C-alpha cells in the first residue's frame, strides 16, 4: 500500500527521500531525521548502512505534498513507516527541510 524511493542522488542509494502515500509521492521533513532513520531507509532498499542522513535540501525541493514529519526511528526497524511518527501529512514544514540519505552502496 505504500513505497519508497531516492531522488535525484545519480544513484539508486542516495538522494531525496520520498514516500508514496494515498497514491501521491511526498517528501519528509528534516525536523527529526537523523542517522538512526537513515538506517531504515537505507536497509529497506537493499542499500547497505547509512554513511549519512543530510538535512535542508540536499538533493533539491519537492513541489508537493510533504507526508512526514518527527519520524524516529529506533534503527532497526524494516520499513520506514514502521517507525514511530506523529501521524501523516506535515502541518509544520516547508521544502527547505526536505530529507535525504547517502548509504554504503553508492557508487
Ligand atoms: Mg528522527
Redesign the pocket.
Known amino acids: 500500500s505504500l513505497a519508497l524511493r531516492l531522488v535525484n542522488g545519480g544513484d539508486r542509494c542516495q538522494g531525496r527521500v520520498e514516500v508514496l502515500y494515498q497514491g501521491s509521492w511526498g517528501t519528509v521533513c528534516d525536523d527529526?531525521?537523523?542517522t538512526?532513520?537513515a538506517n531504515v531507509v537505507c536497509r529497506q532498499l537493499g542499500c547497505g548502512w547509512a554513511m549519512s542522513a543530510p538535512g535542508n535540501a540536499r538533493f533539491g525541493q519537492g513541489s508537493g505534498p510533504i507526508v512526514l514529519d518527527?519520524?524516529?526511528?529506533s534503527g532497526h526497524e524494516s520499513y520506514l513507516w514502521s517507525c514511530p511518527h506523529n501521524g501523516w501529512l506535515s502541518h509544520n514544514c516547508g521544502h527547505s527541510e526536505d530529507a535525504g540519505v547517502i548509504c554504503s552502496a553508492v557508487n
Not at 518527527?70 to 526511528?73: A, E, G, L, N, P
Open positions: 527529526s531525521w537523523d538512526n532513520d518527527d519520524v524516529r526511528c
